[PDB]
Design an enzyme around this catalytic site. Structure first.
Site, PDB file in Angstrom:
ATOM      1  N   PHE A 179      44.356  86.784   4.904  1.00  0.00           N
ATOM      2  CA  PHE A 179      44.794  87.039   3.413  1.00  0.00           C
ATOM      3  C   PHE A 179      43.581  86.195   2.554  1.00  0.00           C
ATOM      4  CE2 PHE A 179      45.951  83.422   0.936  1.00  0.00           C
ATOM      5  CZ  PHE A 179      45.735  82.434   1.829  1.00  0.00           C
ATOM      6  N   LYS A 180      42.794  85.647   3.119  1.00  0.00           N
ATOM      7  CA  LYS A 180      41.860  84.911   2.482  1.00  0.00           C
ATOM      8  C   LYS A 180      40.614  86.031   1.774  1.00  0.00           C
ATOM      9  CE  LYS A 180      41.968  80.075   4.282  1.00  0.00           C
ATOM     10  NZ  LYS A 180      43.266  80.395   5.073  1.00  0.00           N
ATOM     11  N   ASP A 181      40.900  87.232   2.486  1.00  0.00           N
ATOM     12  CA  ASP A 181      39.887  88.283   1.914  1.00  0.00           C
ATOM     13  C   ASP A 181      40.610  88.755   0.493  1.00  0.00           C
ATOM     14  OD1 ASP A 181      38.637  88.629   4.401  1.00  0.00           O
ATOM     15  OD2 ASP A 181      40.168  90.093   5.314  1.00  0.00           O
TER      16      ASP A 181
ATOM     17  N   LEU B 166      38.314  86.162  -1.471  1.00  0.00           N
ATOM     18  CA  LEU B 166      36.929  86.313  -1.222  1.00  0.00           C
ATOM     19  C   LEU B 166      36.450  87.611  -1.577  1.00  0.00           C
ATOM     20  CD1 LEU B 166      37.127  83.462   1.416  1.00  0.00           C
ATOM     21  CD2 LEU B 166      35.822  83.418  -0.646  1.00  0.00           C
TER      22      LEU B 166
END
Ligand SMILES: *Cc1c(COP(=O)(O)O)cnc(C)c1O
Ligand SMILES: [Cl-]
Ligand code: NA
Ligand code: NA
Ligand code: NA
Length: 496
Positions: A113-115, A118
């Site tokens: 989920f950090k995509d 980012l």
């Protein structure tokens, strides 16, 4: 109205900035986090949002929080972020299971989920630099042992006006994690393995950011440092979007009518994901409860159950490693809001955490704290949960997601709450395949690559590009340096 949303440091009432400034500066020099001092007015009309694309929901939410950006600047950022890097045009599809809904946040470049944030942070930064009349390339320094390294590299790769240097601990990551980073393409991306104490690497990055002589050299060479760490507001605000999108999908599919409250269970590490859900509630999203899910590293569970935050405890490397934390960085923003947006009182508690190893929350806003529930799941419970959801729903959860679904079952049992609940699913099982395959098959001793092959045979779900052919992908990064040589290597690379 010409008013812009004021972002203030949690540790300095006089350190006020706009959204574009907070994103470009990343960290406040006072040690605090840039935080919205008020909540913007957002018209959440689900009769319209139920039919909106992900990008349309992003424009509504980002326009409200990042309000010193123009509509044309935000469209540019949204269209460049939420493109073919995502493996489904839905971006964040909500899946209905027997007793819960799973919000899949693993369809980006690195199946984690950090995509979500980012993918867009780089465009916020370069757009902010131009808005402020800066003609500098932005240099991001990242020192991490988690999935943030790969997500940051993948988000900044080939973004014009940016360069990213990621430091990771040598022999401190899995073979599948190492190859994800060392095979990463993009001439503006570089990954360096650190030999030695990795705490020194994180200290050295902070030292470089505060080095006045180094800052002068970057300025002369048309460069400036920024940070893409857990406390950049640009990584938190895009996360508000998918809570509104999940709710819109429940309305669109007839699971709820607009106005019904829903709960969100969030696998939590540094707290930005669940804090984004809190900000969604503050702009009008009907949220009944935010359930903070922890692994064996349960400092947050103890905090919500006793109001004492105590970091003097054993640290465990677990099967849900992105949640192995002692200091949840974004909890400080919730502490600030709990204290009525009071920077002096927040600074006092943060200084106590540093000098005493603990603090107790007193004289807080009970309306805010009562929105949160918390439980933790053991490693056995994590595996048992992956197995149970596979048996019941023919669906395989990654370990971080399973910590959250196991915690939701504990929350239901302890409270009897029947409110419909969405699990924030933070990674694909393809990103942590050994624990997932061993949990559903009973097999033991599998290597990372053996587990990838078996997960495809078991699930029938296509192997995502991030891990497809990773075993034979070309190695583009083979640099290992001592922690003490990091600054000299950065200065030589930047031509300073
Ligand atoms: C980073 C991460 C988390 C924790 O997210 P926070 O917003 O820091 O609480 C959970 N699961 C996965 C897979 C992650 O990568
Ligand atoms: Cl390099
Ligand atoms: Na791009
Ligand atoms: Na209902
Ligand atoms: Na609203």
């Amino acid at each position: 109205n010409a008013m812009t949303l004021v972002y203030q440091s949690t540790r300095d009432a006089n350190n006020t900035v706009t959204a574009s400034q907070a994103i470009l500066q990343g960290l406040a020099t006072d040690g605090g986090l840039f935080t919205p001092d008020t909540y913007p007015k957002v018209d959440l009309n689900f009769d319209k949002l139920k039919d909106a694309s992900y990008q349309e929901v992003a424009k509504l939410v980002l326009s409200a929080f990042l309000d010193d950006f123009t509509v044309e600047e935000l469209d540019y950022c949204i269209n460049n972020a939420y493109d073919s890097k995502f493996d489904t045009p839905a971006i964040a599809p909500l899946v209905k299971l027997d007793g819960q809904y799973n919000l899949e946040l693993f369809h980006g470049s690195t199946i984690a989920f950090k995509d979500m944030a980012l993918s867009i942070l780089p465009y916020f930064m370069t757009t902010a630099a131009k808005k402020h009349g800066l003609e500098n390339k932005i240099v991001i320094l990242t020192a991490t042992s988690g999935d943030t390294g790969k997500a940051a590299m993948a988000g900044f790769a080939n973004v014009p006006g940016t360069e990213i240097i990621v430091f990771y601990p040598k022999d401190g990551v899995s073979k599948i994690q190492e190859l994800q980073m060392t095979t990463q393409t993009g001439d503006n991306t570089h990954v360096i393995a650190i030999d030695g104490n990795f705490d020194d690497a994180q200290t050295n990055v902070k030292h470089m950011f505060n080095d006045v002589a180094l800052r002068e050299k970057l300025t002369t060479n048309k460069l400036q440092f920024s940070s893409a760490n857990s406390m950049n507001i640009g990584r938190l605000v895009p996360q508000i979007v998918y809570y509104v999108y999940a709710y819109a999908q429940l309305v669109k599919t007839g699971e709820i009518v607009a106005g019904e409250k829903v709960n969100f269970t969030v696998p939590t590490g540094n707290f930005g994901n669940i804090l984004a859900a809190f900000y969604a509630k503050q702009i009008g999203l009907p949220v009944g409860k935010l359930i903070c899910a922890s692994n064996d590293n349960n400092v947050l569970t103890d905090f919500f159950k006793t109001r004492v935050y105590d970091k003097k405890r054993e640290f465990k490397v677990t099967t849900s490693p992105s949640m192995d934390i002692l200091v949840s960085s974004n909890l400080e923003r919730l502490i600030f809001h709990l204290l009525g947006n009071n920077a002096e009182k927040t600074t006092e508690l943060m200084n106590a955490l540093n000098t005493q190893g603990q603090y107790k929350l007193t004289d807080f806003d009970a309306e805010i704290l009562d929105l949160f529930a918390a439980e933790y799941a053991t490693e056995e419970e994590t595996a048992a949960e992956i197995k149970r959801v596979c048996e019941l729903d023919s669906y395989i959860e990654d370990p971080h997601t399973a910590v959250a679904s196991a915690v939701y079952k504990k929350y239901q049992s302890a409270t009897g709450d029947v409110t419909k609940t969405v699990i924030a699913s933070t990674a694909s099982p393809y990103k942590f395949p050994v624990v997932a395959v061993e949990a559903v098959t009973g097999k033991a001793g599998l290597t990372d690559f053996e587990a990838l092959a078996q997960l495809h045979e078991i699930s029938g779900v296509a192997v995502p590009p991030a891990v497809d052919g990773l075993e034979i992908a070309p190695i583009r990064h083979k640099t290992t340096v001592a922690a003490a040589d990091m600054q000299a290597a950065v200065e030589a690379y930047l031509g300073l």
